[PDB]
């Protein structure tokens, strides 16, 4: 009972799962802890800061470039300066878009901190269209009022009063400014799929599904509806649901009708292009169509966070590229700070992009000169000898899949599936909510089954891995493009021994 | 008519202003810019990354604190692991609260990425606490309606219908059921002081008075009510009017009556102990006063945000220990950073801290192992001494103050006050809209005065200065502590010659 100042109840439960270990040192796919006698034990890290370290860590080019660009006296904070390395990052991130989609679109590029704080770049710049949509519809609807009154205060047509069950010409004019003010000052939606992980700030976390992690915070932001990955037949009379009013009046030269018409609800569509919160599942292209469907419908933005997905992940620079998801705002993250800073991006198409956003929204630390600099060496890393990286990824990606698809063949007892692509690879474990060892059903009833797997492959096998999906219910693997034959025959052997004690439901030598 | 990626509006509006330069290198209290000739200028910086740099811009002690960090393979991204780094940077800021306060209180951290993303752990805290109080009043309400039902079906006590105006005994119980739970599901409401700036996310934009950068966005989330910091008489009067009723039923033993119990609607009190939205005003002991009454009477956290205050900046490690406000949460970020890294933290006291936040709520690069690093240094720095850096602060600040008001007094046709503390200080100008000269009136009108003077600063005195407050009406000075005592005379030569080309009125001179 001393004194502790953060993380009590984070400590305690790594401790109990098997997860209590400091690392004091990491390189390439590497993290070293201390044994009880002060030697470094070195551990294969599969997690590799839930997919930001594509270069693996600490990566020698990255380190020397950090340490020239502080001892150049970059600018870090020049505010309201110009700072040219921006476009010149967006200039690159444009090129690779046109390359890897054929398509000769255009991107604006406004970076922050974090890839929440770019989903909420893209939340903000959509309700600013929305904001757009709603003032052209309202000047209509003035207009609209303004000629059925002249029409009604002067002979040429009757009001209808079958269309009054909706709400005397000035009192129902009023009556609809009323209906129509209500509705306007209404919170918008925003779509995304079942699964979705989008951050966990006071805006993203109602984008995110993970029920104990979003429920608390629901009265505090607009809600997303979240749309059933799996059967998109269904999505069509969700959306159809959510359909609003606002009120005019309508002349047919003869008759004055009071008449509903579409109100702009729907702020934004998001997507991953592979669904981390999913449990590493690739969008499918039903589903990529039923989204493309829903956006040109709307005529709300298709927002793309490849805050995971991005930077070569997939073993192409975007993931929607890969999947043909067309979005129309696109985020990254994770992998642009070279796995030491931190930087995020939003790209908003040019031909949507309002200028105001580039002069009302800003933050302090977005855009330094530091994560500026190491965003351009990430970017000159990736697209170095012709894409010979992309084609690394992807031909390590293919070994790793086959490895765990090997490995699920002789365990499906354990293992339902192998789901991702590139290095963005996870394992769906089989419910173990009824399982013999009272021990290992406890703690799958708990919905603590892979972080507790997670702790036997650390202790026994030397190897970091932490679970996806909302009951740890999936084991993530994500490694460096560096992970060698070698680090994935000793995985295989790891997950074997772990299927192999969880199918002999050894509860004493997998929970502590 | 070329392509650009990034920054056209933002870098066309600085040009229009005079502030279009590339600052290319910066050491210390100076910015470089390259001339024709490719030479380097110095320029004076009081801008300072919006006050991030209390230690200049690259000091020595940072920069090989952070090289030896990236050298000794830090490990940056080991998230769901033992960092006791955090728990030893929250340790030091305990015990400094301890010292400047006397108070013996408890704070628990959590890191976050910036300023904006620290308040919103502080919100969606705040948003735990009232949901914990509202569960708490509905199981009373429950045990309530149980009680005056036994009653009112047996005998004991007669239902009065003098208070049925607020909605038959089991249908009276559906209406109230019906009441409350619209009530429960309402958006919550926080308070702010008028000219408050909290960031600038989906939630703290609510927080931010800046009615351009906030009112766009207002449908989004939860807004706030700007509180008058300057009349505090009527402050009780305003949150007295947000008050809110649940219902339940009373039982006298004779009696049984509906009645109103007060719901809890306010999530939050926020303040800046000096506000930097408002020109640098101090929070007067009369407002400290009325925040302190305003948290005893609705029980909601009053939130200290110290994002720009925090590390020293006023003459003391926290604002609100120098100006006695009693926060329950407190938030830093700028100049923790070292003026290189991203970082920010959320201090809760631990009588109030409800352990469910340290598993729900995560960020992928939060208590990176780099920045937590740089922490512990820029702490170990600020502390050095005895506190002897905090008198450096307290001594330059009156040097610098009183060269303000040596400028003012010899001004005042056109510098109406001198505003802040330590070395966050401003000048506020007087209203230009009716000045002689048309180029200045037109700017003034648009709200552009300040950054065209800081324009006339920079080409014509080299010297950065940057505008703060809701129309440019004030010019921002926070300097490092290490800024020159003819770094301050080139600074007054500079404000007399500004401030006599005011006077004269001479647009040409001012308006590119
Ligand atoms: C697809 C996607 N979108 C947004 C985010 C939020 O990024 P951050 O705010 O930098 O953590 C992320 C972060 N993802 C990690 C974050 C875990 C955590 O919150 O610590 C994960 O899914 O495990 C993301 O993956
Ligand atoms: C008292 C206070 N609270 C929160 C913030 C937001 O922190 P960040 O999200 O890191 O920009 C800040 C940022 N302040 C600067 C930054 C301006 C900007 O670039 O957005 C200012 O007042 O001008 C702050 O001062």
Redesign the pocket.
């Known amino acids: 009972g001393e004194p502790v100042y953060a993380d009590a109840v984070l400590n305690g439960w790594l401790t109990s799962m098997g997860l209590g270990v400091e690392y004091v040192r990491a390189e390439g796919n590497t993290v070293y802890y201390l044994d009880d006698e002060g030697r470094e034990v070195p551990v294969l890290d599969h997690a590799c800061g839930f997919g930001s370290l594509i270069f693996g860590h600490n990566h020698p080019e990255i380190i020397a470039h950090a340490k020239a660009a502080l001892d150049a006296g970059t600018v870090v904070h020049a ?1 309201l300066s110009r700072q040219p390395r921006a476009n010149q990052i967006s200039r690159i991130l444009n090129d690779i878009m046109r390359r890897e989609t054929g398509r000769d679109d255009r991107y604006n590029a406004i970076f922050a ?1 974090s890839g929440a704080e770019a989903n909420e770049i893209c939340m903000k710049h959509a309700e600013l269209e929305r904001q757009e949509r709603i003032t052209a519809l309202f000047a209509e609807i003035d207009a609209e009022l303004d000629t059925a009154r002249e029409a009604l205060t002067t002979g040429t047509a009757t009001l209808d009063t079958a269309s009054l069950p909706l709400v005397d010409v000035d009192g129902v004019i009023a009556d609809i400014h009323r209906h129509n003010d209500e509705r306007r000052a209404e919170r918008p939606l925003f779509l995304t799929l079942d699964g979705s992980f989008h951050g966990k700030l006071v805006g993203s976390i109602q984008l995110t599904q993970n029920e104990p992690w979003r429920t608390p915070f629901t009265a505090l932001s607009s809600p997303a509806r979240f749309l059933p990955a799996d059967e998109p037949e269904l999505i069509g009379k969700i959306v159809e649901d959510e359909r609003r009013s606002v009120l005019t009046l309508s002349l047919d030269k003869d008759t004055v009708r009071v008449v509903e018409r579409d109100f702009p609800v729907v702020a934004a569509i998001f997507v991953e292009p592979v669904r981390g919160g999913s449990g590493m599942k690739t969008v499918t292209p039903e589903l990529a169509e039923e989204l493309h469907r829903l956006r040109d419908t709307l005529g709300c933005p298709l927002v793309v966070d490849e805050v995971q997905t991005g930077i070569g992940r997939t073993g192409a620079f975007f993931g929607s590229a890969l999947l043909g998801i067309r979005g129309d705002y696109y985020t990254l993250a994770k992998a642009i700070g070279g796995g030491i800073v931190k930087n995020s991006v939003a790209l908003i198409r040019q031909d949507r992009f309002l200028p105001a956003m580039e002069v009302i929204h ?5 855009k330094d000169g530091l994560s500026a600099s190491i965003a351009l060496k990430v970017l000159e890393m990736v697209e170095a000898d012709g894409g010979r990286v992309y084609q690394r990824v992807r031909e390590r990606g293919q070994r790793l899949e086959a490895m765990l698809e090997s490995v699920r063949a002789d365990h499906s007892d354990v293992v339902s599936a192998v789901w991702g692509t590139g290095l963005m690879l996870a394992l769906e474990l089989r419910d173990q909510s009824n399982a013999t060892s009272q021990a290992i059903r406890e703690k799958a009833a708990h919905g603590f089954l892979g972080y507790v797997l997670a702790g036997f492959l650390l202790r026994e096998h030397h190897i970091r891995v932490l679970p996806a999906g909302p009951r740890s219910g999936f084991l993530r693997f994500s490694p460096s493009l560096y992970i060698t034959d070698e680090e994935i025959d000793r995985t295989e052997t790891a997950l074997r021994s772990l299927f192999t004690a969880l199918r002999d439901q050894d509860g004493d030598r997998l929970v502590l």
């Open positions: 505010q901190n800003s933050s302090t630390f977005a």
